[PDB]
Amino acid sequence: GAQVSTQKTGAHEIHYTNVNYYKDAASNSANRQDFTQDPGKFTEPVKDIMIKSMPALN
Amino acid sequence: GAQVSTQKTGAHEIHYTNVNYYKDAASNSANRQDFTQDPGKFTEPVKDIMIKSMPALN
Amino acid sequence: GAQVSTQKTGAHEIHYTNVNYYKDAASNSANRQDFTQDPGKFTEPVKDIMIKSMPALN
Amino acid sequence: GLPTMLTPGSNQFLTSDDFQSPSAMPQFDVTPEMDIPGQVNNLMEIAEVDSVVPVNNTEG
Amino acid sequence: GLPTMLTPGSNQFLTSDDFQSPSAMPQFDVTPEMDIPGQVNNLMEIAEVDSVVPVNNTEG
Amino acid sequence: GLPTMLTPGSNQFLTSDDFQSPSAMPQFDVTPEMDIPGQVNNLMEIAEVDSVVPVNNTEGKVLSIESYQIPVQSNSTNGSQVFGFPLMPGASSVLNRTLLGEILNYYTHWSGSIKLTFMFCGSAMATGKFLLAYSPPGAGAPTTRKEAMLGTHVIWDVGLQSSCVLCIPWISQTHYRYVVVDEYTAGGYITCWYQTNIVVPADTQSDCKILCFVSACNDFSVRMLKDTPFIKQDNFYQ
Amino acid sequence: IARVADTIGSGPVNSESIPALTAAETGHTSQVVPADTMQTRHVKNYHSRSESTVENFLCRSACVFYTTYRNHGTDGDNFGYWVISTRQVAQLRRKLEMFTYARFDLELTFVITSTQEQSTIQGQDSPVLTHQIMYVPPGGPVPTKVNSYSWQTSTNPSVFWTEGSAPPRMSIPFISIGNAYSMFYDGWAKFDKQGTYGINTLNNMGTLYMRHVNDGSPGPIVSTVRIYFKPKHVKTWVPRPPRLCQYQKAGNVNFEPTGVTESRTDITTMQTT
Amino acid sequence: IARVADTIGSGPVNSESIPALTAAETGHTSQVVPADTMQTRHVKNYHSRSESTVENFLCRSACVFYTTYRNHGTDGDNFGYWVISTRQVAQLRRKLEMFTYARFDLELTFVITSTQEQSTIQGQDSPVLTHQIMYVPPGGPVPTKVNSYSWQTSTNPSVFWTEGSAPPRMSIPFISIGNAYSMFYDGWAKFDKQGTYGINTLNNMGTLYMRHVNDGSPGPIVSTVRIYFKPKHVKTWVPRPPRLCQYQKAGNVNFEPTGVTESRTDITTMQTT
Amino acid sequence: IARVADTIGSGPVNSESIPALTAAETGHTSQVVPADTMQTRHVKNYHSRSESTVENFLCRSACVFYTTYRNHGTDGDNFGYWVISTRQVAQLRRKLEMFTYARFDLELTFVITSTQEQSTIQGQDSPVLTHQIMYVPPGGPVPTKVNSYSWQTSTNPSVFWTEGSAPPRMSIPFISIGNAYSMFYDGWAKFDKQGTYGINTLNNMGTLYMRHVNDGSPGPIVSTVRIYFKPKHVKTWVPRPPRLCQYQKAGNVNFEPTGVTESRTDITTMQTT
Amino acid sequence: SDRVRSITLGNSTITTQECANVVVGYGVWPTYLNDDEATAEDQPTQPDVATCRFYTLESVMWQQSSPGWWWKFPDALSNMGLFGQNMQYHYLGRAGYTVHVQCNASKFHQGCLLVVCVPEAEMGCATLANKPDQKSLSNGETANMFESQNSTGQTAVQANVINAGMGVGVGNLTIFPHQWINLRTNNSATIVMPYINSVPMDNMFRHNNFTLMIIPFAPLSYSTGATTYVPITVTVAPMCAEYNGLRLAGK
Ligand SMILES: CCCCCCCCCCCCCCCC(=O)O
Ligand SMILES: CCCCCCCCCCCCCCCC(=O)O
Ligand SMILES: CCCCCCCCCCCCCCCC(=O)O
Ligand SMILES: CCCCCCCCCCCCCC(=O)O
Ligand SMILES: CCCCCCCCCCCCCC(=O)O
Ligand SMILES: CCCCCCCCCCCCCC(=O)O
């Protein structure tokens, strides 16, 4: 049970291996590459869709 | 994910193994065997081909 | 790239494993079991075959 | 045992390292996760929100 | 990291050990080997050669 | 845990080791690479470029541009020498400060053939023939043109093509040589003589200049990195 | 990949669409890009947001407290204790308090250093020191002396450490009784609203105890233990404005009123700063 | 394989082809081999250029600075700092400056050594020392005392190290805002051209801070930290002539004019040297 | 398998074949086995020659030199150096000199030990010592002081070592410019035959430099470094008779004439010995 | 033959009957910045004819004791037509250059000039503590002269030609794209320089970042009665010039 993942490399011109040693999931290392984004919660929390090009208010 | 490469040995009369441990590509070891050569940039930067046996200037 | 070889054991009534870690062939361990023998260079350097049972000189 | 060689950086505490360590509380059963509103995964989701600018930040 | 236990013989210098060590000159390109006459692979090839015996090794 | 035994070399700092270490800045996103002109992958691509040689590095000339200028003039005798220096690209002061020699001083061993280009920077009405000779070691340095033509040489005829190349072939008993001066790895002697005279018409300058360039051939190579004796320091630059 | 958006090419416009005009009263933050109010070129942006994730922003070891204990004591009374909290330091407290709720595992690290004290007890030749950090969860028996029975640690987790070696480290899971750690609490502890008000109501994490396992030598010695927290496997909820005023207490959010920003000369001075 | 070219066999020649004659005015470097001006034999050359690659030429640990800090101080004011640069040493500066642009990762190593000072504080028996190197990027809060709050290192990367163990080492990626590190800059910092001129314009790497994590003991002690840089994963652009004159300053390329080479007696003396 | 030959069975003989008679003038060494001059039985010999290979005979760590350097010095001038050679010790020199040519890689190991010196500088409490061995190949800049710029080791390979840990070790490849290391050289360095004659002509290996990286403490200290060579991956050519006379110099093979063996009473005395 | 050559850029043309060849940078012809290399988002300006054309600088006079000259670019073109105009109104810029140095003689004249383009040619001051002032580094359209002796001055540049103002060996300058004007061989030298920098675009007023040096390695020489006025004219043309960041004019 070894996990081969992709290292953090540069763009515009590379794997590491991981084995878990302990029985608890808290003993693992950090989730350094959990890239998720949902900004709509805070920037567009309104009920109606509010298209950009249209006027906000009639 | 283990990489078996050829060691540096002598010519005229031999592998090592590599595993990456860290998540960043900068944590890796040096590229000791990146043998590339393009001397034409500095020694023949002229526009025309300039064949050797021919006279350089007419 | 692991090499499984036969250990040195006794005769008349047993493997070890080897992995290379470094990029240079000089970093390896010694060739403790390179058993080759050619004594004829020093003990029979003569031009003619010189069979044993025959007289050396006529 | 397995022959090993210690390399530079052994026994050092680098505050930004990713290693595994033993749990002081083995087999602990954490509370079940709950769906809370307003989860943040990136700090750029906070910078992308409007905030008032004190342009008239004069002395008084 | 990987949990490991140190065993007796650690940090000892035994003059007849077979280990791998780092090269102080990385990527050095050695001279090409040459076919020299008289290569010796075993010391028993030297003992199997005749040599004169000083049988008359008296005092003078 | 896994039983392990520590071996010699543990906790040692060898300045030429290849190991992996943790990044103090995890997940850092480097700037995107750009296509810049003039990428260098090998230092031998720099040594293979021509560079002017200060052949006239005499006591007063060395602090001036006249170090590079090799004086040639019209003579009344025959067979005179123009210059001469030893084939020591790493140790000779005639060569160790060029692009080729500056790179050699970072290394302990060299090998391969050398090129010596000569540009005739005189008038267009001037004419001359020159004997560019190389002599391997074992006998002394040649002292006359009769002794230089026994060795490796090229007779240079000046004309529309202003330059000429004397290729110093690799003739040694070892595969490499020492950058430092050593009697076991002597290199030989480079000499230039007059194969004829500098013949010039009236109202022209009899005195001319010649330029020397030195660059490595495609079989040139270096070995055993070291520090240079060229740069020094007494205390930290503030 | 937390890769940012590419810039799209845009030419001249003349139409009824009004991307620049909006109503900020709606609470909606406008999604205008530069390609809406000017002719842009095409840019393939390779920049990534990998470093502003909440895991990377928070996964840094930070010192949260240090205390001192001696070897001689009286009588004694030469040991250390810390009631665990994340609010006694300014730096880590402000990062954790950018959110209202957080769930994470911890990486706990200790840095123990010993100092020789002024005295006339020459000559001193003291063997290596060994320290014992004991964690007592809420309700367990507390050490009263430096040699009391509680140090047996039959069920209480303890780490023993000898000086000169790597600093000790262990992982702690998410241990709260709630579904998330609270950085902020806007209620009281008692139902009648008397008593403690605020985040101190939920602070029941426990206590750490430190001592020398060695018997005290003639030469006086004082040791200081630095605790370092590192959040791991993070999940944050409800971000809030960063703390502007300087902290005063650990139990509450009491502050001294502070200006909104640094002032400048006038409304048009470009010397900012 | 960075294998050099084999030598080809060549016999006598008599023709119109003129490989030895050329025009050096063109800027083209002639590609003449020895097989063009003499009868050569065939040589299978097995020599390789593996050691002159820019990675191997540059991938050597080099000391770039060392500074000292004490344990007593006043008041104090017993800590060290270094504004990071690669131009305070002659040896590594000349290697990096053979190119105009370089991109690489670094391997950073420290060698910390402590020395006992002259005093009459007998007798001294001091426990092992622990050092803390903190890196403060540009703009972050600076340590003002040896015990100030900035040493908490909530977000600033720091390495803790106890004496007697392996020298600490960590990797740094390529961190510049440009697409390449500049060894040379031929402009000013301000648009009006007043102010700093040259490579100092682009020096904004940060600062390192060092201290003893231990409290000071009675016996005086001074520690020196040696920083070592090792370029990794190198890419170089636009090689330039090696520095001939001895360096004078770190911020600029100011020099004292030097002769082209070592002089000799005359144009024909073979005693060189 | 380096297994020796089995003994074949042989009965009585009466014939013209003469295996025991030969001509030693031919230079041929007779290949007579015991089965040619007596009735032998059959013996399955399981003895092997695995221990007399040139690799096993030579692959033993051997001390080749040790030198001392101090911490105080003047002024200073407290550092060590060794011009590398294999001919300053008797034991390893005689093994290597059983052959005329050898090609091998080396395993280099150091054993550094420090000693306290007589003084009245009480009291002394000195932190752990760190040593730096620098290797300067031929032509490189030499250290002139214990703190000169050459110790930066920008390109020169150096190993840093703290006391109390495993002795440092590194591998060196085969580095000669010839196709083999020469143990013996029967020529001069200059073509006119003036100057150095013999194996010293080819000795251009380099020099090692040692120092304390620590600043000197009040208490005097002297350290000694022992260098150990271990041939690896060996290839030997042209064996020659072992050295009979005791060595005198390192550069040459000069000797004092010695008897062929130990003498005995007469030609028939069995008391040998 | 290969000695003749013509170069047409914009409404300008240069003919040469006695040249050597064209040296093209590091083998790279100048091009426009691509979408995957760009970082500035606004649509760039490309005049493409009014700016990418030939401009002739101020001529110098080769004398028997002239150590050499140097120009900084694009500071030399900062007042040349519409190329200088776009530089003033824009924050960012980008160009490559065709450089044509021209010096003719009488076939009885002798002397060899080194013509080289040095990228990022940072120059040292004559006083080690100070920095060279703005005018000593680049006089714009006028050449700054090398000296054949040590320079003096608080803000002066160390213009001793043996180190070329940079602290290097002047004979080692052939590592950069260079050419030679040898009076017996050719009367001109031309180099095509691509845009070289650590960023895709830069400010054209606070950065150069290449210098043009003209150093006589063989001095000018002639017999009495020959023409003694031998000038060297420099004609540069920006190639593929584009601009970003329009605003009010300056500097
Ligand atoms: C032997 C060492 C064991 C120590 C175990 C320590 C466990 C204590 C819990 C630490 C987590 C506290 C986090 C609270 C967060 C908050 O209040 O905002
Ligand atoms: C705890 C240790 C962390 C230290 C991190 C140090 C990062 C500083 C950046 C080093 C690279 C500087 C290279 C500049 C090259 C140049 O200017 O030519
Ligand atoms: C930091 C340590 C590096 C030291 C590198 C030492 C390399 C020196 C060469 C050793 C081999 C010499 C063998 C010569 C054999 C002979 O002369 O017979
Ligand atoms: C961090 C790099 C770890 C390298 C691997 C060392 C640990 C042992 C790996 C054993 C792999 C087989 C186990 C499995 O089946 O998953
Ligand atoms: C430098 C030599 C490293 C030797 C290997 C030790 C590390 C563990 C190897 C585990 C191999 C399986 C992982 C994988 O699938 O790639
Ligand atoms: C000396 C015994 C070494 C034991 C093995 C430890 C090193 C890691 C082995 C990894 C094996 C997989 C690598 C490979 O594919 O060759």
Author numbering:
A (entry chain D), B (entry chain D), C (entry chain D): 2 to 14, 25 to 69
D (entry chain C), E (entry chain C): 1 to 60
F (entry chain C): 1 to 238
G (entry chain A), H (entry chain A), I (entry chain A): 11 to 283
J (entry chain B): 10 to 260
What did the published study say regarding this structure?
The genus Enterovirus within the Picornaviridae, a family of non-enveloped viruses with a positive single-stranded RNA genome, is comprised of more than 100 serotypes. Human enteroviruses (EV) are presently classified into four groups, Enterovirus A-D (EV-A, B, C, and D), among which EV-B, the largest group, consists of over 60 serotypes, including all 6 serotypes of coxsackievirus B (CVB1-6), coxsackievirus A9 (CVA9), over 30 serotypes of echoviruses and more than 20 newly identified enteroviruses. The capsid proteins (VP1, VP2, and VP3) adopt the classical eight-stranded anti-parallel β-barrel configuration with the N-termini residing inside and the C-termini exposed on the surface. Most of the uncoating receptors bind to the “canyon” sites of the viral particle, dislodging the “pocket factor” in VP1 and subsequently triggering conformational changes of the intact particle to release the genome, albeit that SCARB2 binds EV71 outside the canyon.
Given that three key structural elements of the VP1 GH, VP2 EF, and VP1 EF loops dominate virus–receptor interactions, we systematically calculated pairwise Euclidean distances between all amino acids for all possible (n2) pairs of these three key elements from 15 structure-available human EVs, which defines a k (k = (n2)) dimensional space delineating the structural characteristics of the receptor-recognition sites. The phylogenetic tree could clearly separate these human EVs into three groups: EV-A, EV-B, and EV-C. Within each group, viruses with distinct receptors were further grouped into mono-phylogenetic clades. This structure-based in silico analysis completely matches the results of experimentally derived receptor identification, therefore, it can be used to deduce the receptor usage for human EVs. To test the robustness of our structure-based algorithm, we determined the structures of three other human EVs (CVB1, CVB5 and Echovirus 3) and put these into our algorithm. The in silico analysis suggests that CVB1 and CVB5 are CAR-dependent human EVs and E3 utilizes FcRn as a functional receptor, predictions consistent with experimental reports.
